Amino acid sequence: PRANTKIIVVGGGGTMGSSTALHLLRAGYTPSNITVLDTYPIPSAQSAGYDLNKIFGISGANKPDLQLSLEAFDMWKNDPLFKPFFHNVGQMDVSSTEEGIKKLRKRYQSLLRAGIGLEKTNFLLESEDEILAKAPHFTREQIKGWKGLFCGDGGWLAAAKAINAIGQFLKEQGVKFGFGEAGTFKKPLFADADEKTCIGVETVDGTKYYADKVVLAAGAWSSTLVDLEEQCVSKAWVFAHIQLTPAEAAAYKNTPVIYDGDYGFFIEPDENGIIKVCDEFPGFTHFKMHQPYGSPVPKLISVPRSHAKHPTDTYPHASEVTIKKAINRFLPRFNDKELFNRAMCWCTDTADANLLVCEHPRWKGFYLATGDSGHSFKLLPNIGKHVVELLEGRLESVFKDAWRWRPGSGDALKSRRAAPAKDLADMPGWRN
Ligand SMILES: *Cc1cc2c(cc1C)nc1c(=O)[nH]c(=O)nc-1n2C[C@H](O)[C@H](O)[C@H](O)COP(=O)(O)OP(=O)(O)OC[C@H]1O[C@@H](n2cnc3c(N)ncnc32)[C@H](O)[C@@H]1O
Ligand SMILES: O=C(O)CSC[C@@]1(O)OC[C@@H](O)[C@@H](O)[C@@H]1O
């Protein structure tokens, strides 16, 4: 029974982590039986969720991605905890290349074959007038040849503030916490020498925590903490900020999120006039020799270079070009705006960009909740709901089979992106 079951959430200061803790409380677990451990206090300074904003949009990449995105959309609008941080201003995919414009038309078409009425909220913008109508800040000369796929369920998310909302709720309820060395996972604990029964974890300062179940929601660090047998390859993405005056930023107030697969995106300025800009690229790895728990020998493993641990870090020289390229493409009027708060942000890719949410195959009681594949912040309100379903063996098979333990199911280095990710060692500029 839930009221006497103890759960440990490793990486609980992050996205999937905090979500799991939230839905444990909502399910009826006793708050004092739930322990959140993270290297950083919630909201974790190093979770990929620690950002001014993230994009919300509907992805049809998989069978349950569609179901999950709509589920998340519902909560972002109607859940009292989350709905303050959803800005439902819409999201527009654009392209002016032949190859790219056809990608849009195929995406629109598969949304219709979902047969769940997505045509009511997704539209192909076939002319420049239709684009300028949704995003008046563009000039017509800037967008000639552009077509757009507009999603009315889209918009952006106050990412850090949202996780923080969960965290403060967890604390009011009485969830237990472990931060710093007292919260940094090192290894699982077992009752038996055969390590078939996990009964807790031990952190790096030596602290041992005991629970009935352990959830590993450590994002890009999961593949480094325990042997995931190359299922998850951690990669970095980049962003930068520019500052606008109240006059300049007024033209972008409540404007839709604009994305082009060949350039990146930007999100409307926040209350301080700050615009976040991203490029799009297959990501950056950081391979090192490491020996995650359960691996018999040290392997080559992409290990996150945490901006939180190294604040003087920025990103490779190459990324500076593509980010500015994106700025020129979308916001040419701000090309002389100096960039600041450059930083790398880490995700972990699976081969098929599906999550890795399953019980460990040998360590009974140890559960994996990661494989976010760099598309999963939008799932903050509802992913924890399905992790709990897994813990209780009530997980709908569509999710269960898609999220199953699956080593040898593809090359996660390339995943579903344009190319295998390049490594930080071959991309100078980020260390200072
Ligand atoms: C990097 C990035 C990601 C991203 C994005 C843009 C960038 C630049 N834009 C997104 C977007 O527009 N829309 C979207 O839906 N997602 C976007 N993302 C990715 C999204 O953030 C991630 O997919 C999502 O955050 C999933 O993360 P989850 O797996 O929870 O991972 P996390 O938030 O980083 O959490 C990791 C927590 O791990 C804790 N940790 C790490 N190591 C330990 C150890 N050793 N022990 C205990 N805890 C550990 C960290 O505290 C961290 O909080
Ligand atoms: O999937 C989305 O809703 C937008 S995520 C945008 C992005 O920058 O986020 C970081 C990585 O996921 C990249 O793959 C990706 O291009």
Domain ranges of the chain: 1-87+154-232+351-410, 88-153+233-350+411-432
Matching residue, tokens 């071959």: 426
Q: How far apart are CA 256 and CA 88, in angstroms?
A: 8
Structural determination approach: X-ray
How close is the Cα of 48 to the center of ligand 1, in Å? 3
Q: Say how far apart CA 189 and CA 168 lie, in whole Å.
A: 29
* 378 CB near ligand 1 (under 6 Å): yes
Task: Quote the CA–CA distance of 126 and 108 in Å, as a whole number.
Answer: 12
Q: What is the DSSP string of 222-279?
A: HHHHB--TTS-EEEEEEEEEEE--HHHHGGGTTPPEEEETTTEEEE---TT-EEEEE-
Residue 225 CB–ligand 1 contact under 6 Å: yes
> Residue of the nearest CA to atom 10 in ligand 2?
374
Instruction: Give the angle subtended at the CA of 378 by the CAs of 12 and 368, to the nearest 5°.
Output: 40
**Distance (Å, whole) CA 382 – CA 386:** 7
Decide: helix, strand or coil at residue 203.
Answer: strand
Write the DSSP symbol of residue 7.
Answer: E
The finding on whether 237 has its CB within 6 A of some atom of ligand 2 is yes
- Give me the torsion for CA of 290, 292, 294, 296, rounded to 10°: 0
Residue of minimum CA distance from atom 10 in ligand 1: 54
H or E element: which one contains 187?
Answer: strand 185-190
Q: Which ligand is nearest to the CA of 343?
A: 1
Question: Measured from the CB, is residue 329 less than 6 Å from ligand 1?
Answer: no
Q: Compute, in angstroms, the gap from residue 141 CA to the centroid of ligand 2.
A: 28
C-alpha–C-alpha distance, residues 180 and 41, integer Å: 8
Query: Greatest CA separation found in the chain?
Result: 69
Helix (H, G, I), strand (E, B), or coil: what is residue 362? coil
The answer, yes or no, to whether any atom of ligand 1 lies below 6 A from the CB of 281, is no
The residue whose CA has the least distance to atom 5 of ligand 2 is 375
Q: Which CATH class is domain 1-87+154-232+351-410?
A: alpha beta
Whether ligand 2 lies within 6 angstroms of the CB of 262 is answered as: no
Q: Which two tokens stand for residue 290?
A: 């490491």
Ligand 1: atom nearest CA of 203 is: 46
- Using omega within 30 degrees of 0 as the cis cutoff, is the peptide bond preceding 43 cis? yes
- Identify which ligand lies nearest to the alpha carbon of 348: 1
Any ligand 2 atom below 6 A from CB of 277: no
Rama region for 408: left / alpha / beta (φ>0; ψ in -120 to 50; rest): left
For the beta carbon of residue 251, count every other beta carbon within 10 angstroms.
12
User: Which helix (H) or strand (E) is 368 found in, with range?
Assistant: strand 366-370
Which strand (E) or helix (H) includes residue 39? none
- Please tell me the distance from the alpha carbon of residue 215 to that of residue 13, in angstroms, as a whole number: 13
Is residue 346 in contact with ligand 2, taking CB distance under 6 Å? no
CB 11 within 8 A of CB 41: no
- Binding site membership of 54 for ligand 2 (Cβ less than 6 Å): no
CB atoms within 10 A of CB 1: 6
Q: Which atom of ligand 2 approaches the CA of 57 most closely?
A: 3
Domains 1-87+154-232+351-410 and 88-153+233-350+411-432 share a fold: no
Task: Supply 68's token pair.
Answer: 């999950």
| Sign for the pseudo-dihedral over CA of 305, 306, 312, 317 | positive
Show the tokens assigned to 364. Answer: 């009974």
Strand ranges, E, within 86-154:
86-87, 91-95, 122-125, 147-151
Preceding-residue numbers of gaps in the chain (C–N over 2.5 Å): none
- The rounded Å distance from CA 136 to ligand 1 centre is 33
167 CB-side CA count, 13 A: 24
Give, for ligand 2, the residue of 51, 92, 278 to mutate: max count of ligand atoms closer than 8 Å to Cβ.
278
List CB contacts of 98: < 8 A, sequence separation 6 or more: none
**Residue 120, phi then psi, degrees to nearest 5:** -75, -20
Q: Is the CB of 213 under 6 A from ligand 2?
A: no
Report the SS3 class of residue 90.
Answer: coil
Q: What CATH number does the domain located at 88-153+233-350+411-432 have?
A: 3.30.9.10
DSSP symbols for 373-412: TT--GGGTTTHHHHHHHHHTT---HHHHHHSS--TTSS-T
Distance from C-alpha of 414 to C-alpha of 425, rounded to nearest angstrom: 17
Q: Residue 127: which H helix or E strand, with range?
A: none
CA gap 1, 23 in Å, rounded = 16
Are 417 and 283 in contact, with CB atoms under 8 Å apart? yes
Between CA 167 and CA 169 the distance in angstroms is 5
The DSSP H or E segment spanning 170 is: helix 159-173
Residue 176 has φ and ψ, to the nearest 5°, of -85, 150
374 Cβ closer than 6 Å to some ligand 2 atom: yes
φ and ψ of 317, to 5 deg: -55, -40
User: How many Å apart are CA 296 and CA 179, to the nearest integer?
Assistant: 29
Nearest to 263 by CA among 89, 94, 61: 94
Which of 47, 50, 55, 383 has the most ligand 2 atoms within 8 A of CB, as the residue to mutate? 55
> Does the beta carbon of 43 sit less than 6 angstroms from any atom of ligand 1?
no
238 touches ligand 2 (CB under 6 Å): no
User: Between 383-391 and 15-27, two packed helices, what is the crossing angle to 10 degrees?
Assistant: 60
Q: Are 414 and 103 in contact (CB under 8 A)?
A: no
Which pairing describes strands 213-216 and 299-302: parallel, antiparallel, or unpaired? unpaired
Closest CA to 120 of 94, 74, 151, 87: 151
Q: What region does 294 belong to: left with phi over 0, alpha with psi -120 to 50, or beta?
A: left
Place of tokens 């909201």: 43
CA distance 344 to 240: 9
- Report d(CA 374, CA 354) in Å as an integer: 10
